[PDB]
Structures are given as structure tokens and as C-alpha cells.
């Protein structure tokens, strides 16, 4: 169905070092395809998925010039933000920027976003209209004024609504074999007690892509969440994901419970049940 | 494909 292209930027000040650490990564959906690290020797934007390796040298010079230019802007941001909040020159601070566009199952534009955070907290963000700004506090208001005066929303809207989608679509085609694949979860149940009256049933989903998934425990066909624990979805390291959900049941009652697995990668939901 | 050529400073 729907898709995303997102860029994540992190920049960390290091008083006593020559420069901030700048890290940038790009994703299409749940798949990372580029990175840049200011401390790495290449001083280059680098490929991280097989499909972008296809791009010619112009693409790579352009992408490396732009990320380097981004790192410079974040470097001055760290210094001006430090002044705005009257912070000591001795501490490490952080700036983070995230932007991207969403596209529907018809691959046409849904949504754009462009957000900025200082020390892990919202600083300034482009609203849904892509014409105005939301500013968290008064330091950010000064910035909003400046960015409004400079017509910055306008630039980003042209990119978010046009260029971003155009490239996302191009990536979807060129990486279709992996970006447009879907890997069904492989599933199983696991069983463990405590002494007498209690036991734990744990339902596993392994090797699935994309990462969105719903794991539901029912007792007697009744959607019941009371005492149900879902671990955060986790990367396998090979491009797929894993997740489990557990219930702690009165022991003897194990046969009543059922695990439901939903994933666009499989044609109908699965039901698993403890069988010994 | 990154936005560019660059972004304004805070």
C-alpha cells in the first residue's frame, strides 16, 4: 500500500573537539538506503541498499554535496541554539532534523513533513499545509519569524510535494524486488510456567517485512488485552523484523487462548494455539 | 534524494 521516504539528521556538539559529529541516514519505508557520517574517512554519502548502487556519479556527487552542506548549517545551528538558551560551552548538545514525504497505494502524494528538535524536544516543525510553522517556545519563534520572512516554507513545499515523491517513486521501481516484496511472518508458540497456577504463552513472528504487524491474544474468541505484553518490533539484521507477544494464563486454561497474526504479507490472518 | 541545495540556519 502506502510508502515513505524519510531523512534523519543528527548533529552532536563536542566542545574540545574540532567539529560536531554529523550523522545522516535515508530510508524508503523500513529499509535504509543511504548514510553519511562526518567522522568516516570517505567524506562521502554512502549506499546501504543494493538498489541505489545503480545511480550514476552525478547522483552521488549531488547527494554528497548536499549532505555536506547540511552538516555546515547544523554546525552553526548548534552554536546559535547554545546562545538562545544561554547554555554553557562545556556541554554536548544535539540537533535533529527529520523530513520526508508519504505516498498512497496509488503512489500519489499524501503527506509531507519537516521537523526539527533541540536536545530531544520539538523546536520547530512544518504544519500539514506545508505553508506555516509550529514553534515550541520563544527561541523557536524568532526562528519562525526569520523563516517566514525568508519564504522557507515555499522551498520545502516544492520539494516535499514534487521532487520527494518523484524520487520515492523512482526508488520503488528500481528497488521493486526488495522494496515491493513482502515476507510473510514465520510463526510459532512457546510455553513456560511458574510453580503451579500460572504459565506464559509467547507467540512469535520471525523474518517478516514490512515491519507493521498486529499480534493479538484472544481468550474464547474474545479480544482481550488485560495482562498482555507486546515487545517492541526489532530488526533481525538481515532486513527483516521480529516480534513476540505474551500472555500469562491460569494454568490448565492454555487451550482457551489463541494468537492472531495480521500482516499485509499474508492473505488471511493466522490463528495459533498452544498444543503440547 | 535530499532537499537542497541547503537549508537556512536557525
Amino acid at each position, epitope marked *: 500500500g502506502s510508502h515513505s521516504m524519510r531523512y534523519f539528521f543528527t548533529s552532536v556538539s563536542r566542545p574540545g573537539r574540532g567539529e560536531p559529529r554529523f550523522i545522516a541516514v535515508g530510508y524508503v519505508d523500513d529499509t535504509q538506503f543511504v548514510r553519511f557520517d562526518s567522522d568516516a574517512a570517505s567524506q562521502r554519502m554512502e549506499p546501504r541498499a543494493p538498489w541505489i548502487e545503480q545511480e550514476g556519479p552525478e547522483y552521488w556527487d549531488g547527494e554528497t554535496r548536499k549532505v555536506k552542506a547540511h552538516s555546515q548549517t547544523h554546525r*552553526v545551528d548548534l552554536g546559535t541554539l547554545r546562545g538562545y538558551y544561554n547554555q554553557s560551552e562545556a556541554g554536548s548538545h544535539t540537533v535533529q532534523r527529520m523530513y520526508g514525504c508519504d505516498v498512497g497505494s496509488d503512489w500519489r502524494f499524501l503527506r509531507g513533513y519537516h521537523q526539527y528538535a533541540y536536545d530531544g524536544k520539538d523546536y520547530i516543525a512544518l504544519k500539514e499545509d506545508l505553508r506555516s510553522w509550529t514553534a515550541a517556545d520563544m527561541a523557536a519563534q524568532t526562528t519562525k519569524h526569520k523563516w517566514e*520572512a*525568508a519564504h522557507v516554507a515555499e522551498q520545502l513545499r516544492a520539494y516535499l510535494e514534487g521532487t520527494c515523491v518523484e524520487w520515492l517513486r523512482r526508488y520503488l521501481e528500481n528497488g521493486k524486488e526488495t522494496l515491493q516484496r513482502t515476507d510473510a511472518p514465520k510463526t510459532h508458540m512457546t510455553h513456560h510456567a511458574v510453580s503451579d497456577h500460572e504459565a506464559t504463552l509467547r507467540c512469535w513472528a520471525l523474518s517478516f517485512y514490512p515491519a507493521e504487524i498486529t499480534l493479538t491474544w484472544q481468550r474464547d474468541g474474545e479480544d482481550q488485552t488485560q495482562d498482555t505484553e507486546l515487545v517492541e518490533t526489532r530488526p533481525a539484521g538481515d532486513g527483516t523484523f521480529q516480534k513476540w507477544a505474551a500472555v500469562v494464563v491460569p494454568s490448565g486454561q492454555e487451550q482457551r487462548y489463541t494468537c492472531h497474526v495480521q500482516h499485509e504479507g499474508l492473505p488471511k490472518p493466522l490463528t495459533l494455539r498452544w498444543e503440547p | 534524494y535530499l532537499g537542497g*541545495p541547503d537549508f537556512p540556519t536557525i
Partner: T-cell receptor
Amino acid sequence: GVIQSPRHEVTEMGQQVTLRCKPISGHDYLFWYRQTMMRGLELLIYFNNNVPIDDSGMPEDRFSAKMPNASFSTLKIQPSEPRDSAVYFCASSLWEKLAKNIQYFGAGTRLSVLE
Amino acid sequence: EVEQDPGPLSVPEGAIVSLNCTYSNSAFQYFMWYRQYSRKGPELLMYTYSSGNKEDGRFTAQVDKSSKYISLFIRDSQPSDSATYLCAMRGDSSYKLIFGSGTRLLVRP
């Protein structure tokens, strides 16, 4: 405005040539261009916050540009050759002027490198 | 590659003048016309994002991105419009401008 020096240079080939530019204070982008007579400008390099960002138009061999601080850039040719004769312009700008493709130009340096 | 007709244009005062440029790379998104008096730096006249028409006094700039063809019209031309006119362009990954070679315009008083 942007101050470039020298205004005129006439030199023999073989010499080192140093061209200088002071951007307008507060501007944080600096561009160096070259124009050969009866033709157009071509970008040699530009800088942002004193860091070279694009130098694709810089000749492979005898040309070198620097920006030691926000108020000063140099472009060096060593050794100079007659084909380097040209007018060299320096320009500076800010992000918001660059979004409207506005740039402030020095008066240029007119360079004749003679045999 | 920006292709521009050099060849001196000589027109009588009051005439409409038409200058234009062709290019080859479809990633150019910003298009500019500069004027330059003999022995001086270039002065921005007009700038276009997209395809389209912008008017400003006696000047109109246009962009046809599918023909890869851009133009500037100057109505009711004046002696002080005598100058070399350069078009310039770029895309979105660098502030580097690519210039055409320029067209010399003489407007006879």
C-alpha cells in the same frame, strides 16, 4: 559591497598570482567566477561558512582557493599562464537572497598574464 | 550545455527585442537573465522557477521546460538596454550557475 583586489593585474607567465576578495560582512556564501572575453561566466568554486562546497569548475592543475575566515578569500594561480587571462569576479550572498537567485558581485579583477 | 546566440543584435530605439537560450539537462529548475555593461559585473534582471511567464515593466521572461527553451523579451527598448545579456541556470543540488555565452545587444538611439 564586495571588495576585490587587485582591480587590475598585469604579469609575466610563470609568476604566482593571488586574487583577493572580502565579502559583505554577515554574508556566509562566497563565489568565485571567471569570464573570458566575448563569453560567459563560469563558476570556479563557492564556499559556505568558509567551507568549500562545490569546486567542480575548478581547473585540475594550477588553481587553489581558500577562505581562512568569514571576511576573506583568496584564489591562487601558480604558476600562471597566458590562458588564465580573464576577469575574475567574486560574489557573496545569504540563503534568503540565494532563494531568489540574488548574489552581490565585486567589481572584478582584470588579469592579463603575458608571455 | 547552454546554447546562446552571440551575434550582435542591433535594433532601433523602441523595438521589441527577443533573446533566448537552449539547454540539454532536464534537472535545471531555475532560470535567470543577467545584463552586463561593458567592463562591469552582471546584474540580475529576472528569475523563473518552474515553467512560466513573469512580467516586470518592459521585461518578460519565459520558460518552456519541455522544449528546454527560455526567453527574455524587452519591449520599447532604450539606448541604456545596450549590454551583453546572459542567461544562467541551475538545479537544486548546488548553487553553481551554468551560464550561456551571452548575446550582445545594441539599441540605436
